[PDB]
Amino acid sequence: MTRYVQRIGERQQHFRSRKKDYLQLSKWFVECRDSEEAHKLSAVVFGSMT
């Protein structure tokens, strides 16, 4: 119940969103004519896991 009242408090301010972003990057992946170039673009997007 306290969580719900708190949520009512959160419902006045919280909202965010970032979906739009993914479209341009997916398209850029579309232009990837070769998957090593695409790997490089991926490393742009998030770097290296290791």
């Binding site: 479209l23 990837c32 998030f46």
Partner: protein
């Protein structure tokens, strides 16, 4: 309070590096370990690399952004652009799902097909599209972006009507790194680095070189007058001193290359050489190129130049010398196939580049660090 860089700090830093991020819910010990030194680590990361450490309730993450992206860096399980496109579409999908929301595999496939922004439509009746989606879903689940209720996606390979029920986990929110504006004001990915450079004017050279060195197995000299290599030459000694104080690595320097070696790798760590046979054949090729320095006279830049024809002759020569002991996979494969795979492999670890047009092979000085041969009992008793 005070803290010092010790075994724990090295291990936490290394553990952080060899994974994209560490989750509290599954790796609480490493997360806590990282947390005790987090103060020194944040300062230090800023000082040497300039990377931003994000510490959260559910995760800790380092946007290991490279100085110049390279093919091997990317998620390797993926093999085509379509895989990345499906990944991005999946991300877009997760933006549409509330935390702990439950969704069907079919809804995800349909939504990805509908949203897919390319000119050429994605079709699920095909096998390749389904394979791309399955690879995307496995990678997604690896980062716990999606939880598993029930079903089996592997059956999806030969049965598109297959169904599975997944649940969107909290991590979907935080997956995307921190990117300041509307990406559209940017016109090409190369423009992204200019962001990474608005924050690092202070000792930009040291942080740039450090990032280049620490990420890649090695750092190749661009030319005779490379400012970066001169810089490396300048601190020279203190870089080595710092590395001894701060990490497992041991620095090496040569006229046309510089790189970090590692003395004690561990299970979770990645290193070269490793089990894959192609490394073995690469080392044998290294010895063969080393053995005729004058015929394979290295250019001023430390590179050794051979044409695709010469490489195929060399591969035949290698099958002649070391071939009885190669793995049956390569022993049974034609020369050109072996050539394609070995050259891609050598590219991934940055030993060499193949010019696409002129077919010239550039073997980087880093290649000459290691050479390999069989045990003497085979040298007698083998491909002798």
């Amino acid at each position: 309070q005070t803290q010092l860089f010790d075994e724990k700090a090295i291990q936490g830093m290394d553990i952080l590096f060899h994974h994209y991020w560490i989750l509290r819910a599954e790796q609480p010990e490493w997360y806590q370990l990282i947390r005790e030194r987090e103060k020194v680590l944040r300062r230090y990361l800023d000082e040497k690399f300039g990377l931003r450490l994000i510490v959260h309730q559910h995760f800790i993450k380092l946007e290991k952004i490279p100085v110049e992206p390279e093919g091997w860096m990317g998620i390797q399980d993926f093999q085509e652009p379509m895989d990345y496109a499906i990944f991005c579409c999946a991300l877009a999908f997760l933006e549409g799902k509330a935390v702990d929301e439950q969704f069907l595999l079919s809804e995800l496939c349909q939504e990805i097909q509908a949203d897919y922004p390319g000119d050429f439509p994605l079709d699920w009746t095909l096998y390749t599209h389904r394979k791309s989606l399955i690879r995307a879903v496995k990678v997604l689940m690896e980062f716990q972006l999606i939880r598993t209720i029930d079903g089996d996606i592997g059956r999806f390979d030969q049965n598109e009507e297959q169904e599975v029920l997944y649940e969107a986990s909290t991590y979907s929110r935080y997956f995307m790194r921190t990117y300041p504006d509307d990406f559209s004001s940017y016109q090409h990915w190369s423009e992204l680095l200019k962001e990474d450079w608005k924050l690092n004017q202070e000792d930009e050279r040291r942080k740039r070189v450090y990032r280049k060195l620490f990420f890649s197995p090695g750092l190749h000299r661009l030319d005779q007058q490379d400012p970066d290599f001169l810089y490396i030459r300048n601190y020279r000694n203190r870089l080595a001193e710092d590395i001894e104080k701060h990490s497992e690595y041991k620095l090496h320097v040569y006229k046309n290359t510089a790189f970090l070696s590692i003395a004690e790798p561990r299970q979770y760590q990645q290193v070269f050489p490793n089990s894959k046979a192609s490394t073995d054949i690469i080392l044998q090729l290294s010895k063969y190129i080393h053995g005729e320095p004058e015929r394979f006279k290295a250019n001023e830049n430390g590179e050794i130049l051979m044409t695709e024809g010469e490489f195929e002759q060399v591969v035949d020569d290698l099958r002649q010398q070391f071939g009885t002991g190669w793995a049956k996979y390569f022993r049974d494969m034609s020369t050109k196939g072996i050539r394609t795979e070995l050259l891609r492999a050598m590219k991934d670890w940055m030993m060499a580049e193949v010019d696409s047009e002129t077919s010239l092979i550039r073997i980087k000085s880093l290649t000459g660090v290691m050479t390999g041969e069989y045990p003497s009992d085979f040298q007698t008793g083998g491909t002798e």
